Amino acid sequence: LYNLKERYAAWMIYTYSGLFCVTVNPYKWLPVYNPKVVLAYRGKKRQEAPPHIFSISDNAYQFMLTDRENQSILITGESGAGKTVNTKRVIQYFATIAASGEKKKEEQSGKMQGTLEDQIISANPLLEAFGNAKTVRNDNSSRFGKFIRIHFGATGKLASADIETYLLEKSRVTFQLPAERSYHIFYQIMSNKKPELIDMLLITTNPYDYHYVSEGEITVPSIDDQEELMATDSAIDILGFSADEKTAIYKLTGAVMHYGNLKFKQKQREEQAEPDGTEVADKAAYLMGLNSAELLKALCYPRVGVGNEAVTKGETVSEVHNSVGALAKAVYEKMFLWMVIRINQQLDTKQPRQYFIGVLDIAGFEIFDFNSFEQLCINFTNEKLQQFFNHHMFVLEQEEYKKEGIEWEFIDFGMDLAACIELIEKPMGIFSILEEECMFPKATDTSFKNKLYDEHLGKSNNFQKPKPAKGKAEAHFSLVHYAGTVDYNISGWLEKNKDPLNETVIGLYQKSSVKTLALLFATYGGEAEGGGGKKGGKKKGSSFQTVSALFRENLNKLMANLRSTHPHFVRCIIPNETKTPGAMEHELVLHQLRCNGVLEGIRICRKGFPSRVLYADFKQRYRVLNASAIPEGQFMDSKKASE
Amino acid sequence: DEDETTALVCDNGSGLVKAGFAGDDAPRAVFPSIVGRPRHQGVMVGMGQKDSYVGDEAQSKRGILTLKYPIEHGIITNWDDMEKIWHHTFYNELRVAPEEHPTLLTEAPLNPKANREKMTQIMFETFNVPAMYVAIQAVLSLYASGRTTGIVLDSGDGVTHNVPIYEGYALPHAIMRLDLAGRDLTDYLMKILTERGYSFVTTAEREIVRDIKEKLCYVALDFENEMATAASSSSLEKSYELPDGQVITIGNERFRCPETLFQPSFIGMESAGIHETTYNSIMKCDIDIRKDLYANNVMSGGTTMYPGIADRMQKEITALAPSTMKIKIIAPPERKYSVWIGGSILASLSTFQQMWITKQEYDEAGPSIVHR
Amino acid sequence: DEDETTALVCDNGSGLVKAGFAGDDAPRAVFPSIVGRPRHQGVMVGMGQKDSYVGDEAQSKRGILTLKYPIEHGIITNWDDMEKIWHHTFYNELRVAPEEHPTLLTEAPLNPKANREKMTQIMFETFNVPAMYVAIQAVLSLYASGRTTGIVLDSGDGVTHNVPIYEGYALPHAIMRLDLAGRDLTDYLMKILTERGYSFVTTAEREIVRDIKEKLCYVALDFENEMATAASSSSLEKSYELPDGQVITIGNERFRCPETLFQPSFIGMESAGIHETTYNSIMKCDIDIRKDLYANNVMSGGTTMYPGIADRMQKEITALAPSTMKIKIIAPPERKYSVWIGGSILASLSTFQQMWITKQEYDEAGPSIVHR
């Protein structure tokens, strides 16, 4: 704690802790990202230069060409740690130090749509408008995870990229905490820099007209919604999107606002929902390439298919408002997914690819007094990532003792975590019990709960019944993750995990005049064959059976990509909740350290032979001791030297 | 996805096989449960000598083959001929290779322990599937209607059953089987329609009596004053046009056929009927669970599709049940595939993965493992 | 407040546990005193494997578990299963952590010295409560009716007792125990009601005979010319509607059931009855204290709630007691919780603080300390 702290009060944000590259939020500006530095760190082992991210980032590259292996960089930290910033910054780094489109390099609309190095870059600012928002911690917080594959060529020059998105905060779209706000886009658009848009979408410039997006805050001083709107705009173009699509995006993003304005009322003497007007529906309908009526019907009189037919079901006021919200979110998401794909599509070149460098940006194990479904998914991700490291280290360590000739035997450090992982991902484990019950037409959260216990309680060690008191809000089940005990609340899971959507409506989308909208829904339309009658399995036709069924699939496809990689680690840190440069709350940093892996890397180090010096890092600092004979050694063989 | 896409669901019936991928909404494959064996030596133009025929090619070519039904009354009676129907299902109908697909199969209500072990022996040892699972049919039907306690009246082509289920466990001692179903019902219509002064003489006349039964048959409520209605001769009559012009009329018999399900006496059966049997199952169960079963009479099976079956059953058991009780007859529209859909749901489910019997379990525990 | 809020009162019975916070007017938690152990391996949907069940989940799921009663006739007979009911009480029912709450418990009339030491051993050593205290049940009932000398007829689910108390000290040699209570009484009604020509066949028929006993049963005074009245057949009859319509009628038996408490001969018991036993307790006590006991017959317990119990007892002992005596049968309305309420009062009291056995007393004196 103390080392970090001291070199921070001195304004040094980069300090290493083994393999890690700790990074602390300056909260102010620094000449570090300096265009001079970039070069400086170019072609240098981390022992030839001071702690910095470009060190990691260059070495990767090096290593990439030297060993002929693919690489990875894992950036991770809490909401306010400032990872995007790094991630982005790493990315620029790659683009710079190994570009050369030759023709694209000239000062003629440089970096505009029409080159990648730019596309690559331009990517961010689009995603950010849609997947970023003002959090109470950050002003531009990443509300989703991501993985880019920079596909380097044979020579060593840029060839392709690849994005993938994980766990998007769908809730912002409909909600927002009091000090927060929704995605930027909304506020961007209503900013009025492109007035047509306002009339085009049929909205106003006052957000308080759109409940969905003004539950929290509307304006942020550090952000210029007007400037961004263009940034965004321009990015779309560069990204190669069709105007139409670029039109869908917009038009589609406004429909969603409108939905939240959709109002209903109880039919008299009936408990049914009946439309409270065709003012808004009209707009939503038009904007989506729909028919007002058909739409309001489907919404109100959802026509289902229980048995072998299609049974028309009536809904309540409360049921509608909620379904609407479900589509709003559903639509936004999908779209977001699409955009990514489309991006990826442009980022696809024909040129050969020999290796890639993966840059992973996701959240780290965060513990809250309230841990719900989303927490499990993330924690699980991290507990995996951790084991991923612990192993790499075990492998790594063991090489030294082999190189040197020491006689040290030890078991994989990952192993310690396998217990927790199996409990989650294995067959009779949490997810399964979670995803099975989702098949029971009449199951309860309570039901699920019991199934969870009857099977794991008393029989499983990592499994425990909660500690209901302290800063926690209710009881259901705790798990014993590497970072500690997490108290999980199981309420909504079943639902959240089912992704219930009014299929009648989706129908309409599926046959929209707005192709794009039509597209986004296709994959739902193609699995319906499979879940034709009441009860059963959605997967028969390609429909998701679990909220969690993919997450896993994606998380596997990932951790696999992570393996055929030479892992490079970066841990981002957040000094003080109060936003003050040169300061640090203790216990706050302490926390991160445990959940980071930093404290676990120190542990494993200390088992044993604590401090471990990297050879160059060893030369430089100590050559001076027998100056003549130690310098000769270090220069003559980077390793043999220290020897 | 490995197996999210990959789980197969095969529902083996007395008349039809229903098959497809867990995930889908309805069976990808539906076909007769026959295996035809050619009575003479010879060939079709362009084909080779075929030793055997299955499903629709056995039905279509029935005049030169001896047709055989592997499943008598829901139970597999011939294992040589069943392995033939499975082979056809995987390789020709779904066109998948079985050795990379988990397979959820179904069995009947009081299916002998030894059979559940034998189809496991054949699934793992002759088809080499990665993993499999056998669900009980009424239990998948219930579950496909969302719930876990209820009583299923299940009725298909060779058997009818009542399977009371409580929090998922089908109750062995309360299950009733009535061997009169849609097969019996097509042959009775046949006679009341020849008896109306007709002739189903060629095989193109025989087959379509079954399509008359499906399209035009009804279960009237107050079957009493429906015969009475028949006589005053209302516009209750219904004429069907045959393969050719020969417009046949069916007024009345239209409902005399499903009245067989409430009165087995119409066909020289001395057994009790569907509604009484629903009830008797119920007064054979624990006392405290009888309000549950009564409010959850789930219907499944091709023969329970006759319109107005539910209303007749509704009133049939209200009037036998103590008035303090709530009666509730659930009959969904997709009911001819309830069983299958319940399997599709269950097998595509997130929590089912830990009940799949894997070749690891089998090679190590013997057929006993899946038998439970 | 530290413990003003914080004192718990747990009354352990043969049929029910009554629990809650000292201060409250009535028990926060009331539930059966059972511990169910599953007869088979399996799960409920969404739950894990459960080794054990307690209270109402054991009653509701009784068909798949072997039910066991830890307290036989008011005495704790199985200590593994009792620690299970306590655990359930603290952690699930009252949802408190026990290690910061003083706990007032109750025991039975001639509870063996060794038991009072054992539940103290379990309270302090496995639940780690700060302090605890064991009150005798009749003694809390008396005290909850304001007084300190009287004789309590206490009658619940497995035992009946008479505990003469003088200025707070229950009189060991005058206490009488009669093992016939509300449990015995529900099973006798059962037979006189099947004997009325009925059937409590399913478990939903069994359970409700007990709700008939509670709602419709009476203790008639002059039970003699009440049978005589039954015969002339007045509008004395009373029909109850079952879980369903099945309106059952109970005219007469309605009071033949509590006449069992005065005549044990109705059930093949040779012991004396409630009123004689009240009396015998009394002619076993000192002479000078007998006018006090007679004017203070306090009744407590679920089975003493039958209307007209007090009038019958009033006249039952007047006519056995010397005429120079004043008889007085106090039967309060909250009597099914007298015991508990007496504990709530006492433990929330300003002067009780100095009788709490603290872990300091225990870790220093051994279980002997609280045993007195």
PDB file of N, CA and C in Angstrom, chain A residues 468-505:
ATOM      1  N   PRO A 468     -26.921 -12.493   6.874  1.00  0.00           N
ATOM      2  CA  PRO A 468     -27.889 -11.461   6.547  1.00  0.00           C
ATOM      3  C   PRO A 468     -27.539 -10.020   7.015  1.00  0.00           C
ATOM      4  N   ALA A 469     -26.674  -9.856   8.037  1.00  0.00           N
ATOM      5  CA  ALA A 469     -26.415  -8.510   8.656  1.00  0.00           C
ATOM      6  C   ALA A 469     -24.951  -8.060   8.560  1.00  0.00           C
ATOM      7  N   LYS A 470     -24.823  -6.779   8.662  1.00  0.00           N
ATOM      8  CA  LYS A 470     -23.606  -6.032   8.399  1.00  0.00           C
ATOM      9  C   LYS A 470     -24.136  -4.921   7.513  1.00  0.00           C
ATOM     10  N   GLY A 471     -23.534  -4.745   6.365  1.00  0.00           N
ATOM     11  CA  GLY A 471     -24.003  -3.720   5.414  1.00  0.00           C
ATOM     12  C   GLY A 471     -24.931  -4.336   4.339  1.00  0.00           C
ATOM     13  N   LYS A 472     -25.215  -5.635   4.483  1.00  0.00           N
ATOM     14  CA  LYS A 472     -26.045  -6.407   3.500  1.00  0.00           C
ATOM     15  C   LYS A 472     -27.560  -6.159   3.719  1.00  0.00           C
ATOM     16  N   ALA A 473     -28.343  -6.439   2.649  1.00  0.00           N
ATOM     17  CA  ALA A 473     -29.805  -6.095   2.581  1.00  0.00           C
ATOM     18  C   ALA A 473     -30.783  -7.282   2.722  1.00  0.00           C
ATOM     19  N   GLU A 474     -30.377  -8.461   2.301  1.00  0.00           N
ATOM     20  CA  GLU A 474     -31.174  -9.667   2.591  1.00  0.00           C
ATOM     21  C   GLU A 474     -30.370 -10.942   2.510  1.00  0.00           C
ATOM     22  N   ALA A 475     -31.071 -12.045   2.649  1.00  0.00           N
ATOM     23  CA  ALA A 475     -30.411 -13.354   2.678  1.00  0.00           C
ATOM     24  C   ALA A 475     -30.694 -14.204   1.399  1.00  0.00           C
ATOM     25  N   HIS A 476     -29.649 -14.943   0.892  1.00  0.00           N
ATOM     26  CA  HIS A 476     -29.901 -16.160   0.003  1.00  0.00           C
ATOM     27  C   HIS A 476     -28.697 -17.069  -0.111  1.00  0.00           C
ATOM     28  N   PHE A 477     -27.571 -16.580  -0.511  1.00  0.00           N
ATOM     29  CA  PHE A 477     -26.434 -17.486  -0.520  1.00  0.00           C
ATOM     30  C   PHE A 477     -25.161 -16.780  -0.834  1.00  0.00           C
ATOM     31  N   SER A 478     -24.206 -17.216  -0.082  1.00  0.00           N
ATOM     32  CA  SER A 478     -22.883 -16.719  -0.189  1.00  0.00           C
ATOM     33  C   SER A 478     -22.022 -17.756  -0.830  1.00  0.00           C
ATOM     34  N   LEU A 479     -21.035 -17.245  -1.484  1.00  0.00           N
ATOM     35  CA  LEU A 479     -20.014 -18.003  -2.135  1.00  0.00           C
ATOM     36  C   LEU A 479     -18.649 -17.572  -1.649  1.00  0.00           C
ATOM     37  N   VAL A 480     -17.720 -18.471  -1.746  1.00  0.00           N
ATOM     38  CA  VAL A 480     -16.383 -18.185  -1.314  1.00  0.00           C
ATOM     39  C   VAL A 480     -15.389 -18.041  -2.453  1.00  0.00           C
ATOM     40  N   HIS A 481     -15.359 -16.842  -3.009  1.00  0.00           N
ATOM     41  CA  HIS A 481     -14.489 -16.518  -4.125  1.00  0.00           C
ATOM     42  C   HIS A 481     -13.092 -16.230  -3.603  1.00  0.00           C
ATOM     43  N   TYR A 482     -12.094 -16.190  -4.512  1.00  0.00           N
ATOM     44  CA  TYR A 482     -10.743 -15.914  -4.055  1.00  0.00           C
ATOM     45  C   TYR A 482     -10.618 -14.612  -3.269  1.00  0.00           C
ATOM     46  N   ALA A 483     -11.343 -13.578  -3.756  1.00  0.00           N
ATOM     47  CA  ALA A 483     -11.329 -12.251  -3.132  1.00  0.00           C
ATOM     48  C   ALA A 483     -12.025 -12.194  -1.775  1.00  0.00           C
ATOM     49  N   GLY A 484     -12.976 -13.108  -1.621  1.00  0.00           N
ATOM     50  CA  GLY A 484     -13.729 -13.225  -0.395  1.00  0.00           C
ATOM     51  C   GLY A 484     -15.111 -13.796  -0.595  1.00  0.00           C
ATOM     52  N   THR A 485     -15.956 -13.560   0.427  1.00  0.00           N
ATOM     53  CA  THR A 485     -17.323 -14.039   0.498  1.00  0.00           C
ATOM     54  C   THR A 485     -18.298 -13.070  -0.077  1.00  0.00           C
ATOM     55  N   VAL A 486     -19.066 -13.556  -1.023  1.00  0.00           N
ATOM     56  CA  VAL A 486     -20.058 -12.689  -1.628  1.00  0.00           C
ATOM     57  C   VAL A 486     -21.452 -13.206  -1.302  1.00  0.00           C
ATOM     58  N   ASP A 487     -22.240 -12.293  -0.788  1.00  0.00           N
ATOM     59  CA  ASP A 487     -23.603 -12.566  -0.391  1.00  0.00           C
ATOM     60  C   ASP A 487     -24.523 -12.229  -1.540  1.00  0.00           C
ATOM     61  N   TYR A 488     -25.114 -13.280  -2.116  1.00  0.00           N
ATOM     62  CA  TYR A 488     -25.960 -13.136  -3.306  1.00  0.00           C
ATOM     63  C   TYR A 488     -27.438 -13.220  -3.011  1.00  0.00           C
ATOM     64  N   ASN A 489     -28.172 -12.294  -3.632  1.00  0.00           N
ATOM     65  CA  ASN A 489     -29.625 -12.194  -3.569  1.00  0.00           C
ATOM     66  C   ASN A 489     -30.198 -12.661  -4.873  1.00  0.00           C
ATOM     67  N   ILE A 490     -31.041 -13.650  -4.786  1.00  0.00           N
ATOM     68  CA  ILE A 490     -31.684 -14.330  -5.915  1.00  0.00           C
ATOM     69  C   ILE A 490     -33.065 -13.831  -6.210  1.00  0.00           C
ATOM     70  N   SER A 491     -33.218 -12.648  -6.702  1.00  0.00           N
ATOM     71  CA  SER A 491     -34.597 -12.265  -6.866  1.00  0.00           C
ATOM     72  C   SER A 491     -34.817 -11.524  -8.149  1.00  0.00           C
ATOM     73  N   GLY A 492     -35.243 -12.281  -9.128  1.00  0.00           N
ATOM     74  CA  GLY A 492     -35.543 -11.721 -10.414  1.00  0.00           C
ATOM     75  C   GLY A 492     -34.819 -12.519 -11.406  1.00  0.00           C
ATOM     76  N   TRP A 493     -33.986 -13.355 -10.768  1.00  0.00           N
ATOM     77  CA  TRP A 493     -33.085 -14.142 -11.571  1.00  0.00           C
ATOM     78  C   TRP A 493     -33.774 -14.916 -12.624  1.00  0.00           C
ATOM     79  N   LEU A 494     -34.778 -15.650 -12.146  1.00  0.00           N
ATOM     80  CA  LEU A 494     -35.539 -16.521 -13.056  1.00  0.00           C
ATOM     81  C   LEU A 494     -35.971 -15.766 -14.277  1.00  0.00           C
ATOM     82  N   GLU A 495     -36.586 -14.633 -14.042  1.00  0.00           N
ATOM     83  CA  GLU A 495     -37.031 -13.740 -15.101  1.00  0.00           C
ATOM     84  C   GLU A 495     -35.941 -13.207 -15.986  1.00  0.00           C
ATOM     85  N   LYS A 496     -35.033 -12.483 -15.319  1.00  0.00           N
ATOM     86  CA  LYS A 496     -33.896 -11.863 -15.960  1.00  0.00           C
ATOM     87  C   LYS A 496     -33.237 -12.838 -16.832  1.00  0.00           C
ATOM     88  N   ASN A 497     -33.222 -14.061 -16.326  1.00  0.00           N
ATOM     89  CA  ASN A 497     -32.614 -15.117 -17.068  1.00  0.00           C
ATOM     90  C   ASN A 497     -33.487 -15.626 -18.239  1.00  0.00           C
ATOM     91  N   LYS A 498     -34.740 -15.300 -18.285  1.00  0.00           N
ATOM     92  CA  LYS A 498     -35.615 -15.818 -19.351  1.00  0.00           C
ATOM     93  C   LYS A 498     -35.758 -14.900 -20.546  1.00  0.00           C
ATOM     94  N   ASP A 499     -35.446 -13.653 -20.308  1.00  0.00           N
ATOM     95  CA  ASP A 499     -35.557 -12.630 -21.311  1.00  0.00           C
ATOM     96  C   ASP A 499     -36.873 -12.686 -22.014  1.00  0.00           C
ATOM     97  N   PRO A 500     -37.916 -12.575 -21.218  1.00  0.00           N
ATOM     98  CA  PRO A 500     -39.265 -12.577 -21.719  1.00  0.00           C
ATOM     99  C   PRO A 500     -39.574 -11.359 -22.581  1.00  0.00           C
ATOM    100  N   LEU A 501     -40.010 -11.627 -23.807  1.00  0.00           N
ATOM    101  CA  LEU A 501     -40.336 -10.605 -24.785  1.00  0.00           C
ATOM    102  C   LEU A 501     -41.663 -10.922 -25.492  1.00  0.00           C
ATOM    103  N   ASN A 502     -42.551  -9.938 -25.644  1.00  0.00           N
ATOM    104  CA  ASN A 502     -43.815 -10.142 -26.331  1.00  0.00           C
ATOM    105  C   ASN A 502     -43.596 -10.404 -27.777  1.00  0.00           C
ATOM    106  N   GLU A 503     -43.692 -11.646 -28.068  1.00  0.00           N
ATOM    107  CA  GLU A 503     -43.467 -12.174 -29.376  1.00  0.00           C
ATOM    108  C   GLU A 503     -44.364 -11.664 -30.483  1.00  0.00           C
ATOM    109  N   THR A 504     -45.519 -11.112 -30.113  1.00  0.00           N
ATOM    110  CA  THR A 504     -46.404 -10.601 -31.120  1.00  0.00           C
ATOM    111  C   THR A 504     -45.784  -9.402 -31.760  1.00  0.00           C
ATOM    112  N   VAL A 505     -45.320  -8.537 -30.880  1.00  0.00           N
ATOM    113  CA  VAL A 505     -44.635  -7.314 -31.279  1.00  0.00           C
ATOM    114  C   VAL A 505     -43.397  -7.578 -32.124  1.00  0.00           C
TER     115      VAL A 505
END
